[PDB]
């Protein structure tokens, strides 16, 4: 694929389609993963005030996965 | 003759007792029999080996643990209970024996040089080739079963109507007569799919006068389940889909034996005869387990009609006992 414009050639095109699935699936995951700690987290803030930081650090971690994915996708794009 | 008279003898206690204007549930046993017998139609690996399975239940072996002297009624079941289902054990035997014959039926289209190009004797083992792997040959046996299902739909719907005739209840009467209007329309549409270019213009015009017969006396009955007629057609579709599975699934069990008891190794040379058993031992038991699921298709067939009201007691409780407990001894 190319990161810009057209891919040129059918083969370059197919590769664009294929890298799109990966970001997509990782993002969908981020959201659902976040819901499970997020509902719990509110209790973590309420009960363990002293440890309000703990709910927050846990929540940040599935977000890192979607960014990590963009670097993989960015790297393959601009080349075959 | 033992096959009809022996279970027929126990139906005599229910002949004597009627509880509705519908005729007593005596026809039920010969309606059961074709489909029930016809559940085994496998090849060398299934049907023709089934012989052993019949002999255990109606005879006596030591091979199975709780079965010792069946003649003293020793089983998993209680000793009395086993004595009660001697009649059934005989009918299980007739079922297994009719299953062996439909193995030879099966080898009419899978063996002989008078019916197909397949060897009259293979050089390895009988049933080396399958020719029921051609879509059309397999299809005709399916379409044969489907027909028996159309008949059973007719059998039920006469019985539905008869209840209000001799019980003098108009609501059931109106329902049984009006529904047969629907049958003209089932047979029209079917002719066009079974023969293909038989109708399609002689059942688009005629269909329209067939649909009016369907509801004409249903409206005298009132009926405030107008949508529920989708489910009455569905019940028709269920008798078709069950006879169909009994046919297709029947041939399918045997076609899995293609890579099981024939040939699945080497080039199909002569040495596979003594190599194939590698696979044979594994498939056999797996096959056995799934064909026990296929013998439940009969009682599932009775339940569409029996338990959903089409001339019979059952539907939401009601006096008389389920046909499952009745056929259990017969």
């Amino acid at each position: 694929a190319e990161e810009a414009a057209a891919s040129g050639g059918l083969d370059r095109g197919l590769i664009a389609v294929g890298m799109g699935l990966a970001v997509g699936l990782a993002a969908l995951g981020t959201g659902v993963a976040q819901a499970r700690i997020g509902a719990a987290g509110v209790g973590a803030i309420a009960e363990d005030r002293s440890n309000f930081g703990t709910a927050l650090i846990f929540l940040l971690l599935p977000e890192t996965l979607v960014i990590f994915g963009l670097l993989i996708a960015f790297i393959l794009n601009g080349r075959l | 003759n033992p096959p009809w008279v022996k279970p027929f003898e126990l139906l005599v206690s229910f002949l004597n007792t009627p509880k509705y204007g519908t005729f007593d549930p005596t026809p039920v046993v010969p309606i059961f029999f074709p489909f029930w017998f016809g559940m085994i139609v496998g090849d060398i690996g299934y049907a023709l080996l089934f012989y052993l399975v019949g002999r255990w239940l109606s005879g006596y072996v030591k091979r199975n643990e709780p079965l010792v002297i069946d003649l003293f009624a020793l089983k998993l079941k209680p000793p009395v209970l086993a004595k009660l289902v001697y009649i059934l054990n005989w009918m299980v035997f007739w079922t297994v024996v009719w299953g062996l014959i439909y193995g030879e039926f099966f080898g009419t289209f899978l063996e002989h040089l008078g019916v197909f190009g397949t060897p009259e004797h293979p050089g390895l083992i009988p049933i080396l080739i399958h020719r029921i792997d051609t879509a059309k040959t397999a299809n005709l046996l399916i379409l044969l079963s489907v027909a028996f299902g159309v008949v059973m739909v007719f059998a039920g719907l006469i019985l539905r109507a008869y209840l209000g005739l001799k019980h003098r209840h108009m609501a059931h009467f109106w329902e049984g007569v009006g529904y047969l209007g629907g049958l003209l329309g089932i047979l029209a549409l079917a002719a066009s799919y079974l023969g293909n270019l038989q109708a399609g213009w002689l059942s688009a015009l005629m269909y329209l006068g067939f649909g009016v017969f369907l509801l004409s006396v249903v409206m005298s009955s009132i009926w405030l389940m107008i949508p529920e007629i989708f489910t009455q057609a569905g019940h028709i579709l269920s008798h078709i889909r069950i006879y169909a599975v009994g046919a297709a699934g029947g041939i399918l069990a045997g076609l899995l034996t293609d890579v099981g008891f024939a040939m699945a190794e080497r080039l199909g040379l002569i040495g596979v005869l003594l190599g194939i058993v590698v696979a044979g031992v594994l498939h056999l038991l797996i096959l056995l387990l799934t064909t026990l699921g296929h013998m439940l298709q009969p009682i599932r067939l009775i339940w569409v009609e029996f338990f959903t009201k089409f001339g019979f007691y059952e539907e939401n409780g009601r006096p008389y006992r389920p046909f499952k407990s009745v056929r259990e001894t017969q």
């Binding site: 509902a39 719990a40 509110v42 209790g43 309420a46 009960e47 | -």
Partner: protein
């Protein structure tokens, strides 16, 4: 399945939970005025008579229509969950039914209610004299006290012992199912409720004539079969080694009133945070606990108001 409609109905019903300021105004009231006060609220739509037993019955009728129909209005995973909370009250109901059957006294003078086990099921059980008839009646809904019962009753038919063992097997089975629904609020509630139960059970059932280890249950913290026997003989030296509990500050206390107040107030606050998981059984779990503790409190105030007992005898309990 399905909690959506159930949860929605239960939230609307919260709108009519009795507020803290109720019980403030109520303490200053005698019995005649408490009844006039009570009749405004939703228990009031079922209030009858000027006798105390007629009030007790009026609490029961409220509880029937607002809590006891709840397993019935839902099915599948939802019914199993609502059932698990109701099972604990069914366990009071079975023990009382069984006792009326064994000791040959009337059906009457038991506390029944409908839920998983309906009024007629209990009536059917009473009417099945043989232990085997009794066992099959109870197997009809298929509920966990049946399956506990089938195992238990085979060993022994001694009444007091049937009850005890019925409780331990019933709790071993419950602890797993409730931890297993994977709701964090319920699990936290469950560990404290269990720790609390082991303590409370030892106080009540001392001097019964039974085993100590027929009252232990799965979910227990630092407590073990040996410690339960220590407590049943009457030694509170078990509590000075008990720690990690938030109940750790009720340690060192001998006064019955002060201990039970502290256990109960924690469990109340614990359940109330069940609305931070309103999804699922959270919201109904919170609801059941608040409505039970209001009914107890209605009963404490009424008695205090009628008989001229001190304001302080109940004022301390009503504020946690």
């Amino acid at each position: 399945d399905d909690f959506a409609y159930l949860n929605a109905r239960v939230r609307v019903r919260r709108g009519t939970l009795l507020k803290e300021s109720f019980f403030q105004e109520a303490l200053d009231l005698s019995f005649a005025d408490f009844l006039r006060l009570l009749s405004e609220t939703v228990y009031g739509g079922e209030l009858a008579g000027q006798g105390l037993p007629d009030v007790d019955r009026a609490v029961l009728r409220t509880q029937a229509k607002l809590v006891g129909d709840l397993p019935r209005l839902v099915t599948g995973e939802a019914r199993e969950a609502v059932r698990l909370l109701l099972l604990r009250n069914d366990l009071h109901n079975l023990q009382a039914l069984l006792r009326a059957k064994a000791t040959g006294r009337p059906f009457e003078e038991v506390l029944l209610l409908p839920g998983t086990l309906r009024e007629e099921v209990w009536r059917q059980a009473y009417e099945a004299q043989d232990p085997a008839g009794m066992a099959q009646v109870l197997a009809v809904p298929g509920h966990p006290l049946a399956r506990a019962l089938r195992a238990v009753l085979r060993e022994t038919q001694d009444l007091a012992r049937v009850e005890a063992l019925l409780a331990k097997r019933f709790f071993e089975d419950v602890a797993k199912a409730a931890k297993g629904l994977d709701q964090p609020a319920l699990r936290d509630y469950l560990a404290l409720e269990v720790d609390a139960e082991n303590l409370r059970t030892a106080f009540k059932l001392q001097g019964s004539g039974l085993a100590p280890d027929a009252f232990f249950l799965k979910g227990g913290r630092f407590v073990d079969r040996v410690r339960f026997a220590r407590l049943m003989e009457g030694d509170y030296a078990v509590l000075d080694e008990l720690s990690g509990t938030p109940f750790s500050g009720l340690s060192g206390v001998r006064d019955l009133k002060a201990l039970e107040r502290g256990l109960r107030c924690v469990l109340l606050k614990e359940a109330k945070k069940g609305v931070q998981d309103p999804l699922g059984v959270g919201l109904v779990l919170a609801y059941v606990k608040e409505r039970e503790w209001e009914a107890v409190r209605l009963r404490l105030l009424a008695r205090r108001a009628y008989f001229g007992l001190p304001r302080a005898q109940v004022e301390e309990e009503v504020v946690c």
